[PDB]
Amino acid sequence: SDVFHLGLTKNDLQGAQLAIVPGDPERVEKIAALMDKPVKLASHREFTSWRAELDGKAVIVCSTGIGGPSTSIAVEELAQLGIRTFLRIGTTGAIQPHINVGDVLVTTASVRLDGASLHFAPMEFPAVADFACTTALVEAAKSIGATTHVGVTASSDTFYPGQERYDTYSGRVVRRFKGSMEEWQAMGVMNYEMESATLLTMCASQGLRAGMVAGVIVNRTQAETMKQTESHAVKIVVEAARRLL
Amino acid sequence: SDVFHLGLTKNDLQGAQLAIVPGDPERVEKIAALMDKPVKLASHREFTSWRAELDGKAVIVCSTGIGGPSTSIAVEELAQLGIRTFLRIGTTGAIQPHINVGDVLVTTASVRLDGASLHFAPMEFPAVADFACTTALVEAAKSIGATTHVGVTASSDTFYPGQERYDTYSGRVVRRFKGSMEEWQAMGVMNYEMESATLLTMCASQGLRAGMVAGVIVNRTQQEIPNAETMKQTESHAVKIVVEAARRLL
Amino acid sequence: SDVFHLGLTKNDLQGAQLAIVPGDPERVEKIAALMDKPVKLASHREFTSWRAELDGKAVIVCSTGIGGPSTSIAVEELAQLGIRTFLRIGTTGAIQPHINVGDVLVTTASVRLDGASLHFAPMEFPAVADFACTTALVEAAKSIGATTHVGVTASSDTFYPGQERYDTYSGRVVRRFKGSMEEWQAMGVMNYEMESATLLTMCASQGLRAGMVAGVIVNRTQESHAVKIVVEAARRLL
Amino acid sequence: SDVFHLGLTKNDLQGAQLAIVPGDPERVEKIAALMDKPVKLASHREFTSWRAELDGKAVIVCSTGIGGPSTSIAVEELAQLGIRTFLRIGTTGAIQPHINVGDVLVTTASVRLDGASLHFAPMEFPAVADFACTTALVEAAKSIGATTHVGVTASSDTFYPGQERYDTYSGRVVRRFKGSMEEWQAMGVMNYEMESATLLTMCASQGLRAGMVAGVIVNRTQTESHAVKIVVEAARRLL
Amino acid sequence: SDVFHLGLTKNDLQGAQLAIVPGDPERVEKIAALMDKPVKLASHREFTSWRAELDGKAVIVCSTGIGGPSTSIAVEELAQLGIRTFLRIGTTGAIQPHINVGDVLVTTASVRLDGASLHFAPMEFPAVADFACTTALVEAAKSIGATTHVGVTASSDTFYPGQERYDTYSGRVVRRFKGSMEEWQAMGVMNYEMESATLLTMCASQGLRAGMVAGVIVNRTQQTESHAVKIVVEAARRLL
Amino acid sequence: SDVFHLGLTKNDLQGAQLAIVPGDPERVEKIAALMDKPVKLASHREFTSWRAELDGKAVIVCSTGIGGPSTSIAVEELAQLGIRTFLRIGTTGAIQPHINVGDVLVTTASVRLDGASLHFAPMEFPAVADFACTTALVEAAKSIGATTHVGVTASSDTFYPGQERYDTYSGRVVRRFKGSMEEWQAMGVMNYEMESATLLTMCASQGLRAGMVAGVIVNRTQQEIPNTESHAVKIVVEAARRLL
Ligand SMILES: O=c1ccn([C@@H]2O[C@H](COP(=O)(O)O)[C@@H](O)[C@H]2O)c(=O)[nH]1
Structure with missing residues (x-):
C-alpha cells in the first residue's frame, strides 16, 4: 500500500483519474456493477474501494464513510494515488417545499457547517463544485429525464x-443553529448532507475537480420507491463519469 | 422613479428581466452598443442605466459602481423593478502565471473578502454563481472563441x-492580508476583482440568478503591463461574450 | 494621471493637502462653488473632482461614491497625491427619536458594519475621527448655526x-441584522451612513486626518448647511 | 430499531448505562471478549455493537468510526438507548518527546480543532472529560503499572x-495550521487524535459522562492491549 | 523587588512552589493564619502577599484582585519567582437549582467568557484544571465531609x-449574553465566577498546575468560606 | 450600602455626578488631596473611594483596579449611585519612539484587546471617548503646557x-500577539494600558460620558519594564473642573 489508510497502490488504480465517491461502503459494488470489468480492490475501516472501466478508461469507486474527517482521508489519499476528479453520489433529504421525493439534486456549492473544511481553506473560501463535473451531472440527469434541481x-x-x-436525547439545539433551518430555506438551500463542504473545499482549493449529485428520498417539510431513486442517482453519476474521462 | 437610487420605473424596463451590470457607468453605453435599439434610461450617482433589445427582448444594462455596497443597491432596486437575472462583466488582473492578458474569466464562486455579502448570508454560505448563467458564459465564450478559464x-x-x-501611501498590509496573494494562488484562485462576492452571495441567497465574466487586463505575476491601451481591447472581448451569453438566458 | 482611478496628476492638486469628499459626484461642483477659483479637474467613474482655493490655499473636492470600497480607492489615491486631511460630508438617517430632519451630526467614531475597514486594521481597532477634525466640525457647526449632535x-x-x-425584494433580514437597529439605538448610536467606518479606520491607522459630518434627511422613527459647515471646518484646518 | 443508525432497541442494552467506544469496529469484539457473556448485537456501517457483562451489570461496546460527525451519531443514539457513561479507548501518536511507545494517555480535556463539537456548545465551552471517568482511568492505569501521562x-x-x-498531495498547510504543532507542543499538548473533542464537548454539555484513554504506538517527535485492559478495569469501577 | 507588580523577591518565597490565590487581599492573611509562621511579605495594589509554612514547606497566599487581567499579573510574577502550583479559593453563586448555599464547587474546566485567556491560547484550547490539583481539592472536601459538586x-x-x-443602570444585556444563563444551566454549568478561565488557561498552556475550589454563598434560582478555605489548605498539603 | 462592591450609598456622593477614577487604590488619596475638603469614604478590595469638592461641587475619586473586569464593576456601581461622567487617570507604556516618560497621552479611542467591552457592545462598536471629556482633557493639558499626545x-x-x-516565565506570546506591537506602532497607536477599552466601551454604549488620560512610565521601544505623574493628575482634575 502506498497510502496510510486506503490500502491501495497506484497499480491498483491502473491509471485511473476519476473516482465516484459514495458514503456507504455497501453502495460501492453496486456502483461498479454498472461499469465494465468491475472488480473489488480493498476494504479498511469505512474505506472499501473498487475499480471498473468506462470506454476502456479506468474508473474507481471508493466509499468515504460518514463525515468530513473520513472524507478528507479518502480524498487526500486517492489524490496521492492519482485521482483528479471526484464525483459524490448519495441520497439526501430536502428542506425545500418545491423539491419532491424522487427529485435529483446537483450541488453547485455548499454552506460550510463543518470543521474539516477549515483545515484546507478559510471560511471566506467557497466550497464550490467544479464546473465540468457539474455540467456532466446536470446533463446526465436530463438524458435520463430526471427532475433536477441545481443549487x-x-x-x-x-x-x-x-x-x-x-427529536433527540437533550431536546436542545445550541444557539448557533436555533431557527437555522428556516433561514437556509429562505436563502434557497436545497438540502442537508454531511460530506460536501469538505469534499468541495478540499478539491477546489488544491487543484482537484469535484461535483455531487443526490437523490431525494424524503422531504422534511412534509420503501421500494427509494430503491428506484438511488438506482437513478447512481445511473446519473456513472453517465456523468463517462463525459469526464 | 419607483426605486430610491436608480431613477427607474418598471415601465422603463419594458418587461426586461435580465440585467448586464458593469462597474463603470462610462461603460454602460458601450455594452448597450452590442445590442439593438439602445436607449439611455437615466444616470444618478454611480448608477447609469440603458435599455436595449436582444433577439427582440428587453434587456437592461446598468452600472453598479466600485464595490459591493454600491452593487447591492443597484441589484436590490433592479430586482424590485423585475430583474431576475444579473450578468456582471468586468476587467481584472490575474494572479495565476498561466492566465494570459486578453483571456476571459468566468467565475464559479468567489472568496468573500468583502463585507456586504455578510449582509445577506453568514460567511459559511457560498458566493456561488447560478448554474445557467455560468453555462451561458462558458458557451458564449466558445461561440466567440476566447481563451477561457473557469474557477x-x-x-x-x-x-x-x-x-x-x-505600492501605496503607507506601503503596509494589515496582518490578515500579509502573504495572502500567495495563498490564493496556491489555492488556485484565478484573479482579484471587487464586486462578485456581494453580487453572487446576495443573488444566490435571494432566488436571483447571477453570472460573472471578466477580461484579464493585467497580470500581477508578469512584469510588463498590458500593451498600451489598445491591448485593453480585452474589455471589448469580454463584453461581446457577456452579451452573447445573455441571449441564451432570455 | 499619477493614479489609476481618479485621473489626476500631483500638479492638478496645486499643493492641496486637504479634501472634502462627498459621496455623490453630482454634488462636488456645488461645494467647490462655495470657495474661490473653483476649477473642474476630472471625472472618471464615481470620482468627479474639482480644485478650489480657500483662504488662499488649494483645496480639493472629490466624490467617493457609495461605500468603503469606492471610498478606500479615492482616499488612497488622493493620499498618494498629497492629501493628508479628509473631510467627509454626507446625508444620513438618524435612528434616535430626538434627532430631527435638517439637523447636523458630527461623528467621533463609527460602528464598523463594513468590510473594507478590515483591510486596514483588525476589528479591535477603533474607527475614530481625528480630534482636530472633529473639533473644526463642532466649531463650524456653531458658526454656521445648526442643530448639532456629536456622537x-x-x-x-x-x-x-x-x-x-x-421593504426590499426579499423583505427579510439576515440573523446578524435582525433587530439590530433597536440595539444600535439603545447604545446611543445616532445614525446610519455608508462610508465613515472605512474612511475613519483607514485614515486613523495610516497617519491621515479624517473628519465626518452629515445632514439628516430622514428619521428612522419619525445639504447647503452641512456643506457650509464642512467648508468652514476646512478653512480651520488648512 | 429505536434509533435510526445503530439498529438497536432499548431492550438490546439490557439496562446497560455505560459503553466503551472505540473507533474501529474490528476492535469491538476483542474488547467485549474480555468481559462476561459477550454477544454480538448489530453492525451497520462503522457502528458495530456488542453487549457484555461486567460484575453482573450489562455494558455495551460500540464503535464510532473515524471523526466527530461519525462519533456524534453513536453517542447521541447510544444515549437515547440509555447510555450515560462513555469511555473511549484508542491508540495514538504523540507530539511530546517524553512520551514513548507503550505509554498510556489519559485526556483531561482537549483542544477543539473539530467542528461537530461546535454543534453542541460554543467554542468557549471546554471539551472537558468527566472527573469520575478520568479518575477511574488513572487508577486503572496505575493498577497495572502503565506509565501514564494525564493532560x-x-x-x-x-x-x-x-x-x-x-507529506501530502499538495504539500500545503492552510495558514490557521501553519506552525501549529510546535504551538501545541509548547502548551504541553500530548497528542493528536480525531474524535475526543466531539465526544467530550457533547457529553459535558448534555449531562453525560465521558473519559478517554489511549496507548502510544508512535511518536512524531521521536501497548494496545494494555490500553484495553485499562479501559475495562476503569469501566468496572464506574458501573 | 525584582518583580514589577507584587514587590516580592525570590527570597521572600523561601523556596515556596505552591500558592493559594484568593481574590480579596483581605482574605490573604486569614488563609495564611491557618498555617505556621504567617508572615506578611508585601501589599501593592490588589496584591497582598503573605508567606506561611505548611508541613515544614513554604507556602504563599497572594490575592489576585477581580478579573482575569489582574490575575494574570499575579500568576505570572509568582511563576517568575518559582511558583508552579496554584490553588484558587473563592466564594461563588451556583446557577443550578439543585446546588444549595454552603456547598463546595470544584472546577474541572471553565467556559471562557473572559478575554485574558485568549492572550495565552486560542479559544479552542480548554480552560482545564490540573488533575493532581483537582483530585486533591476533591479528596479534601470529602475528608472534611462537605457537599461537593465537581464540574x-x-x-x-x-x-x-x-x-x-x-438590575443595572442600563438594564440591558448585549445580544451575546441575552438568554445566556438558561443555556449554561442546560449545559450543566454549576456557577459563575470571574477568574478561573484566565487562571486555568494560562496555567495549562505554560506548564503550571492549577486547581479551583469555591463555596456557594448564593443561588440565582432562589462556615462556607471556612469550609472552602479549609479544603484548599488541606488540598495544598497533598500537593506539597 | 446601596451597591454590592464599593460599599457606598448615594448619600456619600453628596450629589457628585463626576468621578475621577484611577487604577491604583493607593492613588485615590493623592488625587483627593489636590481638591477641596477631601474625605475618605470606603475601602473594599481594590475599590478605595474618596470624595472632594471642586468649585463648590462634589466629586468622587474611586480606584477601579487592574483590568476591565474590575473596572466594569466600579463604573457600573458608581453609575448606579448617580455618577454620569468618568475621567480615567492612568499610567502607560508608550510604543512610539518620540513619546517621553512623563508625557501626557489623551486617548480618543482604544483598540479592544480586552474582553469585557464585548460584554457591552460587539467588537464592531468603537471604544471611543466622550467629545467633551476629551476636549476638557486636551485643553486642561494645554492650560498647563505639558507635553501632550492625543490619539x-x-x-x-x-x-x-x-x-x-x-521577558517572562515562558518567554513566548500566543500567535494572536506575535509581532503585534509593531503593528499598532505602524498604525499610529501611542501606547498600552489596561482599562480604557472596557471603560470607553461600556460608557459610550450606555449613555455615560467618559474621558481618558495617562502618564508615560516606560517606552516599549526601549525596554519592557521601567527602572510628571503629578502633571497627568493635575490635568484630570483641571479637566474635571470644566465638566462640573
Ligand atoms: O455568583 C457569583 C459568584 C462569583 N462571582 C465572581 O467570582 C469571584 C469569586 O470570589 P473571590 O475569590 O473573587 O472573592 C467573585 O469575587 C466574583 O467576581 C460572581 O461574579 N458571581
Whole structure:
C-alpha cells in the first residue's frame, strides 16, 4: 500500500483519474456493477474501494464513510494515488417545499457547517463544485429525464443539532443553529448532507475537480420507491463519469 | 422613479428581466452598443442605466459602481423593478502565471473578502454563481472563441491592501492580508476583482440568478503591463461574450 | 494621471493637502462653488473632482461614491497625491427619536458594519475621527448655526439589510441584522451612513486626518448647511 | 430499531448505562471478549455493537468510526438507548518527546480543532472529560503499572493538515495550521487524535459522562492491549 | 523587588512552589493564619502577599484582585519567582437549582467568557484544571465531609452583563449574553465566577498546575468560606 | 450600602455626578488631596473611594483596579449611585519612539484587546471617548503646557503577552500577539494600558460620558519594564473642573 489508510497502490488504480465517491461502503459494488470489468480492490475501516472501466478508461469507486474527517482521508489519499476528479453520489433529504421525493439534486456549492473544511481553506473560501463535473451531472440527469434541481446544499458535521433536529436525547439545539433551518430555506438551500463542504473545499482549493449529485428520498417539510431513486442517482453519476474521462 | 437610487420605473424596463451590470457607468453605453435599439434610461450617482433589445427582448444594462455596497443597491432596486437575472462583466488582473492578458474569466464562486455579502448570508454560505448563467458564459465564450478559464475568484472590498498591493501611501498590509496573494494562488484562485462576492452571495441567497465574466487586463505575476491601451481591447472581448451569453438566458 | 482611478496628476492638486469628499459626484461642483477659483479637474467613474482655493490655499473636492470600497480607492489615491486631511460630508438617517430632519451630526467614531475597514486594521481597532477634525466640525457647526449632535455613527456596507430595512425584494433580514437597529439605538448610536467606518479606520491607522459630518434627511422613527459647515471646518484646518 | 443508525432497541442494552467506544469496529469484539457473556448485537456501517457483562451489570461496546460527525451519531443514539457513561479507548501518536511507545494517555480535556463539537456548545465551552471517568482511568492505569501521562489532547477533524502534515498531495498547510504543532507542543499538548473533542464537548454539555484513554504506538517527535485492559478495569469501577 | 507588580523577591518565597490565590487581599492573611509562621511579605495594589509554612514547606497566599487581567499579573510574577502550583479559593453563586448555599464547587474546566485567556491560547484550547490539583481539592472536601459538586464553571469578564444581570443602570444585556444563563444551566454549568478561565488557561498552556475550589454563598434560582478555605489548605498539603 | 462592591450609598456622593477614577487604590488619596475638603469614604478590595469638592461641587475619586473586569464593576456601581461622567487617570507604556516618560497621552479611542467591552457592545462598536471629556482633557493639558499626545490607545486584558512582553516565565506570546506591537506602532497607536477599552466601551454604549488620560512610565521601544505623574493628575482634575 502506498497510502496510510486506503490500502491501495497506484497499480491498483491502473491509471485511473476519476473516482465516484459514495458514503456507504455497501453502495460501492453496486456502483461498479454498472461499469465494465468491475472488480473489488480493498476494504479498511469505512474505506472499501473498487475499480471498473468506462470506454476502456479506468474508473474507481471508493466509499468515504460518514463525515468530513473520513472524507478528507479518502480524498487526500486517492489524490496521492492519482485521482483528479471526484464525483459524490448519495441520497439526501430536502428542506425545500418545491423539491419532491424522487427529485435529483446537483450541488453547485455548499454552506460550510463543518470543521474539516477549515483545515484546507478559510471560511471566506467557497466550497464550490467544479464546473465540468457539474455540467456532466446536470446533463446526465436530463438524458435520463430526471427532475433536477441545481443549487446550494447545507453540509453539516452532525445528523441532528446541525440540521436543527429536536427529536433527540437533550431536546436542545445550541444557539448557533436555533431557527437555522428556516433561514437556509429562505436563502434557497436545497438540502442537508454531511460530506460536501469538505469534499468541495478540499478539491477546489488544491487543484482537484469535484461535483455531487443526490437523490431525494424524503422531504422534511412534509420503501421500494427509494430503491428506484438511488438506482437513478447512481445511473446519473456513472453517465456523468463517462463525459469526464 | 419607483426605486430610491436608480431613477427607474418598471415601465422603463419594458418587461426586461435580465440585467448586464458593469462597474463603470462610462461603460454602460458601450455594452448597450452590442445590442439593438439602445436607449439611455437615466444616470444618478454611480448608477447609469440603458435599455436595449436582444433577439427582440428587453434587456437592461446598468452600472453598479466600485464595490459591493454600491452593487447591492443597484441589484436590490433592479430586482424590485423585475430583474431576475444579473450578468456582471468586468476587467481584472490575474494572479495565476498561466492566465494570459486578453483571456476571459468566468467565475464559479468567489472568496468573500468583502463585507456586504455578510449582509445577506453568514460567511459559511457560498458566493456561488447560478448554474445557467455560468453555462451561458462558458458557451458564449466558445461561440466567440476566447481563451477561457473557469474557477474561483477573490473579491476584495479594497483595491490595494485586500489584493496585497504595497505600492501605496503607507506601503503596509494589515496582518490578515500579509502573504495572502500567495495563498490564493496556491489555492488556485484565478484573479482579484471587487464586486462578485456581494453580487453572487446576495443573488444566490435571494432566488436571483447571477453570472460573472471578466477580461484579464493585467497580470500581477508578469512584469510588463498590458500593451498600451489598445491591448485593453480585452474589455471589448469580454463584453461581446457577456452579451452573447445573455441571449441564451432570455 | 499619477493614479489609476481618479485621473489626476500631483500638479492638478496645486499643493492641496486637504479634501472634502462627498459621496455623490453630482454634488462636488456645488461645494467647490462655495470657495474661490473653483476649477473642474476630472471625472472618471464615481470620482468627479474639482480644485478650489480657500483662504488662499488649494483645496480639493472629490466624490467617493457609495461605500468603503469606492471610498478606500479615492482616499488612497488622493493620499498618494498629497492629501493628508479628509473631510467627509454626507446625508444620513438618524435612528434616535430626538434627532430631527435638517439637523447636523458630527461623528467621533463609527460602528464598523463594513468590510473594507478590515483591510486596514483588525476589528479591535477603533474607527475614530481625528480630534482636530472633529473639533473644526463642532466649531463650524456653531458658526454656521445648526442643530448639532456629536456622537457614534453606524457605518453599513448595505443601504437595505445592514440598516435593517424590510421593504426590499426579499423583505427579510439576515440573523446578524435582525433587530439590530433597536440595539444600535439603545447604545446611543445616532445614525446610519455608508462610508465613515472605512474612511475613519483607514485614515486613523495610516497617519491621515479624517473628519465626518452629515445632514439628516430622514428619521428612522419619525445639504447647503452641512456643506457650509464642512467648508468652514476646512478653512480651520488648512 | 429505536434509533435510526445503530439498529438497536432499548431492550438490546439490557439496562446497560455505560459503553466503551472505540473507533474501529474490528476492535469491538476483542474488547467485549474480555468481559462476561459477550454477544454480538448489530453492525451497520462503522457502528458495530456488542453487549457484555461486567460484575453482573450489562455494558455495551460500540464503535464510532473515524471523526466527530461519525462519533456524534453513536453517542447521541447510544444515549437515547440509555447510555450515560462513555469511555473511549484508542491508540495514538504523540507530539511530546517524553512520551514513548507503550505509554498510556489519559485526556483531561482537549483542544477543539473539530467542528461537530461546535454543534453542541460554543467554542468557549471546554471539551472537558468527566472527573469520575478520568479518575477511574488513572487508577486503572496505575493498577497495572502503565506509565501514564494525564493532560490535554489535540482533537483534529483532519488526519493531514489539521496535524500539520506536509507529506501530502499538495504539500500545503492552510495558514490557521501553519506552525501549529510546535504551538501545541509548547502548551504541553500530548497528542493528536480525531474524535475526543466531539465526544467530550457533547457529553459535558448534555449531562453525560465521558473519559478517554489511549496507548502510544508512535511518536512524531521521536501497548494496545494494555490500553484495553485499562479501559475495562476503569469501566468496572464506574458501573 | 525584582518583580514589577507584587514587590516580592525570590527570597521572600523561601523556596515556596505552591500558592493559594484568593481574590480579596483581605482574605490573604486569614488563609495564611491557618498555617505556621504567617508572615506578611508585601501589599501593592490588589496584591497582598503573605508567606506561611505548611508541613515544614513554604507556602504563599497572594490575592489576585477581580478579573482575569489582574490575575494574570499575579500568576505570572509568582511563576517568575518559582511558583508552579496554584490553588484558587473563592466564594461563588451556583446557577443550578439543585446546588444549595454552603456547598463546595470544584472546577474541572471553565467556559471562557473572559478575554485574558485568549492572550495565552486560542479559544479552542480548554480552560482545564490540573488533575493532581483537582483530585486533591476533591479528596479534601470529602475528608472534611462537605457537599461537593465537581464540574464546569462559567468564567465571565463582567459581574453583571456577562452573568446576565438586568438590575443595572442600563438594564440591558448585549445580544451575546441575552438568554445566556438558561443555556449554561442546560449545559450543566454549576456557577459563575470571574477568574478561573484566565487562571486555568494560562496555567495549562505554560506548564503550571492549577486547581479551583469555591463555596456557594448564593443561588440565582432562589462556615462556607471556612469550609472552602479549609479544603484548599488541606488540598495544598497533598500537593506539597 | 446601596451597591454590592464599593460599599457606598448615594448619600456619600453628596450629589457628585463626576468621578475621577484611577487604577491604583493607593492613588485615590493623592488625587483627593489636590481638591477641596477631601474625605475618605470606603475601602473594599481594590475599590478605595474618596470624595472632594471642586468649585463648590462634589466629586468622587474611586480606584477601579487592574483590568476591565474590575473596572466594569466600579463604573457600573458608581453609575448606579448617580455618577454620569468618568475621567480615567492612568499610567502607560508608550510604543512610539518620540513619546517621553512623563508625557501626557489623551486617548480618543482604544483598540479592544480586552474582553469585557464585548460584554457591552460587539467588537464592531468603537471604544471611543466622550467629545467633551476629551476636549476638557486636551485643553486642561494645554492650560498647563505639558507635553501632550492625543490619539489611539491599545488596551489589553494582560500586562505581558497582550502587550507583547517576552521577558517572562515562558518567554513566548500566543500567535494572536506575535509581532503585534509593531503593528499598532505602524498604525499610529501611542501606547498600552489596561482599562480604557472596557471603560470607553461600556460608557459610550450606555449613555455615560467618559474621558481618558495617562502618564508615560516606560517606552516599549526601549525596554519592557521601567527602572510628571503629578502633571497627568493635575490635568484630570483641571479637566474635571470644566465638566462640573
Ligand atoms: O455568583 C457569583 C459568584 C462569583 N462571582 C465572581 O467570582 C469571584 C469569586 O470570589 P473571590 O475569590 O473573587 O472573592 C467573585 O469575587 C466574583 O467576581 C460572581 O461574579 N458571581
